[PDB]
């Protein structure tokens, strides 16, 4: 009882974004997700701490899920902020964990290990090909989609048919992750050491050095590359609509819908906007408020995604090289929407 | 002599279009240009012949230019009509070739090779992206722009400054080649096997299978795609003007300008035209007759381009898709033309 | 018996490098390769003589091969010492040449003429763009690759399959030529007039004057450029591996492999080395002695290239400016190798 | 036909041993066996790969046989070189499969799944007892014996009674596998991590640390263990004879007899041979050619197996600590051979 109280607080203190969205879910269901996020957010803390030697991570991370069956475990001064607190007093998480139906214990435990090894694979190398790019997103987000999806089926709140093919689920995750990777470009490169996720298979066509876009002189090629990334992201939209339209439970829907609409809105702002190369673009608090409101039932949300896909395509001219590819990606997306409208 | 006289006889037989504009040329330039054409024409035959195995082409095409240095070489059973004769009696071409100035020879030999190798590149891969489309047009037409431009400087008829930047020279070719690719859609997609040049990046918004455009049922989409192709072509117009505006010699100008005015005329007739998918759209012999008549100096050729670009723009409503796309490209062309009137 | 015997005598004294490797081929094929070299070396003698006006070379070279069928042709007052003897008594060369199979002759003559006009092209212009750098290397090296390959097929020692795509054969030559061009920087620049083969497109990013690299003051940037040159060279390794992997005959293999491993070993020494800007970096005699011994079969030569490539990568830190560009180029190389291990 | 081509090409690059023996087979049957191998070879890749997490294999391998009907499935980061190229381009394999006979398909899918699950079992534990040894060989070899046998009956080539008892079919597979495990002892133990297959129940009687065999100090006790392994494989011989005798179709027999005579030949060499603890014992490439030539019909192959089984015993004395055990296991095989003469 006392433990769950720590989780929801440490949560609300770790991700103000997620914390609000999760409130759309039902209590029992919500709890599982809450712990699930914390389990991953804990793993993400060890991976991110750059003051920790690599071989260490490659050694611990893999078997981080094993500490889920040990209510005595915890980690010392690893990470900073509230994150460092989650590890030092991780005990509370493992507690609430053992009080979850064995059904949820498996999903969380499995997804954890899988994501654990995934991160380790990329601690050795960087993102080169489109394949790499997609694999990374799968490891840090795709699997989350897989996880959440399984929990929906495990709770009976969602038809068992939903777990049959977890492809669209992966798309749900990849979309959000890619949207961020694109949006947080500048920040990623301003850190020391500089983090780069944009696959060379793409940015190389527009430059020899990715730090060149940091300059206002290479803007032309920069923005162009930006649209190249945006396009790559739109490929998932059609599948996002499919996954959303296949949800029956209104509680689960809103929880899965909002994050997607937020991304589309953000993706429409970053698309063909040089501002992405020096500042962090964000959607007005009013827009995100509107999004939260109407994203309660399939129809309203679909017409919202409709607007943002048209708002995105409206931000381009007839003299942009990506003109044709973008329009096609937009049409397909809309197609999928009308398909369910 | 007897060889050179054959070149002209075969030229007038194979090409009833080019052979007419080449007479605007002069006697060494015309001979060189005549030989240069026959060389590329012989190359195109072997490459476009589908009965010929691919591996062969990839082994013989890259060295096709070497034959220019061997007056005994020829080809027996290849191509239809006069084309077969051109290869069977290629001796004459090489015979005459050897009597040209090393300057002219180097241009022809060099360009022939570069083109041959470029062709070999697209023999084992489809034209997927817009970039692919531009590269192809560069290999088979853009390079002809370079060649001729180099022949001008070589002959001393044009200022050496011209060959400094061959970018616009490439635009001259791409404009012609694309216009033909757009105009000869039906003829190409009907051959066996069907020849496609329209880049997927563009036609995939309107259709899954390109053959669908032959069916009147998909006329609506066919026309939209068609207009997307035209917009893609209008991009080169401004540069076409710049190149023609940079020519000083009368002969060279007319020879370079006529084909361009012819293209802009054909383009203004195929644009938003639904007949391009079931017949070959041509200009009246009167329209072209006039073109050959007035395209002898900048000023006249300019107000003709202006006229045709206007006719082209006056063939669309505010209601339909590419309105904005086109009107923008039309203004750029005109604006570029006025900048010289 | 006197003519062919003269060929080797001159060969051994003009090329102390090639003259060694060539002894790996069987007599018949070896004699052909011997003439092929002497012809190219003679062609190289004219182009290299700087005490001879340009318009002279531009007239003679293009029609050099024609002298192959003339048992009395020769040239005097060209080349230093021995090289001069070659041209002075070029009679023997053509005599022994007039006894080589019609197959070989057509190859030597073919490549000769192609290379000749290629040199003439770069006698009036400089190596400005990367395309120029690649084309130049193709004219002086790439062609040697094509040529040698054709001789292998002609001799019947290699399957005719080998000459179906000389793209990698070109990569072979470029890798050697590029390596030497990089290693022999100081040597070439100190000559009067200063010889520069490093493309502006690459070094213009690090300096205004290329002579600045001779001064210890600009040492830093000089090294960065050196690494970019090496990076530009590593692009061919994966292809070099493919070519050697497609060889079946022992003699042909060693003869083709040895020079390659030598280049790689040399490249691993010059990479990120400042000494390159003031002396000739050589590999130990024992190092080459080893290469000659083990480079007799694929697998053996592969692990060497493997060791040398890793040593090259081990000669740097993540701090280095090109680290990433190289890191991925290194993996790309090792991958092709493992692909055959 | 475009996919089946990819198969044979990849097979020759992977199995240079099997690749030849499979050509013996007849057209129709030939294709089936080709796929069947590439299916098990693809599966074998995921297993052999050590860098892959253990939980990945257990979640994937068991469901591998299902990807056969999914004509667009493939894998990327798996296996080194050519084997990696198979999983990545596994498309052709799944297509060439979808075209095979319904009967042929069911069998390949069956053996695959079964074998896959057996591998997952031995992926989480070592080989301790002889039973473990035999069961392991059953999964990676004995099952193939069943597979092929079920393919001979399916094709109709062989009697339908040939599939009632697959015991001998298992012995066929084990004999080959055990002959390799014993022969490749060194090559396996010299990898990181060290691969050990010899059952503890057999080597413990001669050593405490199996690695000791790599040192000449324990050579004497290494040879005894080796001879214990041979006596362990001779058991299957009498059974291998019955199976080969049950065959009737020429093509099927040759394809089944060659590998067996090869194993026995290899066994006669590695028996009581101490060179097994530092190198790879191969059969003279001349002897293997003989085996290939004469193993086309039962009679010839019986006298060869005869010779090799006598060559095995013609290497020991009555003093050896195994004499008795071997001597009789030989006569047990020798008689079983003459029982068909
Ligand atoms: C700076 C000048 C740019 C040079 C670009 C010229 C190359 C354009 C391709 C020439 N072309 C393509 C098709 N045609 C028409 C013909 O194929 P052609 O035999 O060339 O007259 P046909 O008369 O319809 O048989 C002409
Ligand atoms: N290819 C490029 C360089 N080399 C080496 C020589 O130029 P080569 O005589 O052609 O072996 P050198 O013997 O070092 O003068 C060969």
Author numbering:
A (entry chain C), B (entry chain A), C (entry chain B), D (entry chain D): 28 to 368
Paper text:
We next investigated the crystallographic structures of four representative lipophilic bisphosphonates (BPH-1218; BPH-1237; BPH-1325 and BPH-1344) bound to TcSQS and/or HsSQS. These compounds contain C10 or C15 side-chains, with or without 1-OH groups on the bisphosphonate head-group (BPH-1218, C10, H; BPH-1237, C10, OH; BPH-1325, C15, OH; BPH-1344, C15, H). In both structures the S2 farnesyl-binding site is occupied by the n-alkyl side-chains, and the methyl terminus of each inhibitor reaches the same position, as do the terminal methyl groups in FSPP (as seen also with the quinuclidine inhibitors). All TcSQS crystals investigated belong to the space group P212121 and contain four molecules in the asymmetric unit.
Unlike humans, this parasite use a variety of sterols (e.g. ergosterol, 24-ethyl-cholesta-5,7,22-trien-3 beta ol, and its 22-dihydro analogs), rather than cholesterol in their cell membranes, so inhibiting endogenous sterol biosynthesis is an important therapeutic target. Here, we report the first structure of the parasite's squalene synthase, which catalyzes the first committed step in sterol biosynthesis, as well as the structures of a broad range of squalene synthase inhibitors active against the clinically relevant intracellular stages, opening the way to new approaches to treating this neglected tropical disease. The SQS protein structure had two major hydrophobic pockets: The S1 allylic binding site in which FSPP(FPP) binds to a cluster of highly conserved Asp residues via Mg2+, and a homoallylic S2 binding site to which the second FPP binds via basic residues interacting with the FSPP's diphosphate group.
